[PDB]
Amino acid sequence: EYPTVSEIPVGEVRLYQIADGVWSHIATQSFDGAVYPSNGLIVRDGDELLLIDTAWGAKNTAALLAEIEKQIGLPVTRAVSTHFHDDRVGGVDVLRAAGVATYASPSTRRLAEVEGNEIPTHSLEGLSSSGDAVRFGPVELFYPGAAHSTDNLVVYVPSASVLYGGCAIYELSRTSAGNVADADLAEWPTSIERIQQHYPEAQFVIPGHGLPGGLDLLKHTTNVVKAHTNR
Numbered sequence: 001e002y003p004t005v006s007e008i009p010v011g012e013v014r015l016y017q018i019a020d021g022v023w024s025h026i027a028t029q030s031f032d033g034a035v036y037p038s039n040g041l042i043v044r045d046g047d048e049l050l051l052i053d054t055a056w057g058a059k060n061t062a063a064l065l066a067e068i069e070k071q072i073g074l075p076v077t078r079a080v081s082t083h084f085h086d087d088r089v090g091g092v093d094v095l096r097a098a099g100v101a102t103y104a105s106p107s108t109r110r111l112a113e114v115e116g117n118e119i120p121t122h123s124l125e126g127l128s129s130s131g132d133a134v135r136f137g138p139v140e141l142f143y144p145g146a147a148h149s150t151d152n153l154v155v156y157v158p159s160a161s162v163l164y165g166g167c168a169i170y171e172l173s174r175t176s177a178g179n180v181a182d183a184d185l186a187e188w189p190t191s192i193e194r195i196q197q198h199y200p201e202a203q204f205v206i207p208g209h210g211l212p213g214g215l216d217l218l219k220h221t222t223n224v225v226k227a228h229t230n231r
Ligand SMILES: CC[C@@H](C)n1ccnc1C(=O)O
Pocket: 031, 036, 087, 148, 167, 178, 179, 180, 208, 209
């Protein structure tokens, strides 16, 4: 069973093996009066690991690296943040000090600097236009357009048919919008449709927060965004 926000003390990180060489990482964080789970991805890259997103904070990201060393025992050599928010770049300094090469699009680095969040060192070129995709080792990076944020990327693992949607994709149990302060509500369904059109073969869909599912998380998210738009 997938670890839920109830089973994880703020400060611990769980790993969940989705497929051969693919895991999600799950942390918890307190925010605005509540506790939320948060997902990222780990993808084996030969004898190294590619990390997708921090574990939401320096303390959680330290624990994430410890859990990876304990349960997998391969070095994290590169990390990609999928947008500029704290649940995605909070902990980047921890990764860089541990020798991880940290990456984000110039869009994400720009917005993180404006916001005062941690800034990944390296830039991912070739993702500034909606529908752009670039290979990054064992994953493909995709910019679907503005959704949860203007810079949000999704990540596809071709070998395992795993689509990591990040915060642009909601889990089924979430029936109201989350933090939409930086969102483009008007474009979000269109951006989700680009994901569906580009990855129709996806078998495992991982939202930014909560339980994984299939491609039906995409239509669920569009439904929730439209309902919010209409409120
Ligand atoms: C999922 C709950 C909301 C508040 N949230 C917390 C952190 N990130 C988000 C998001 O919307 O992506």
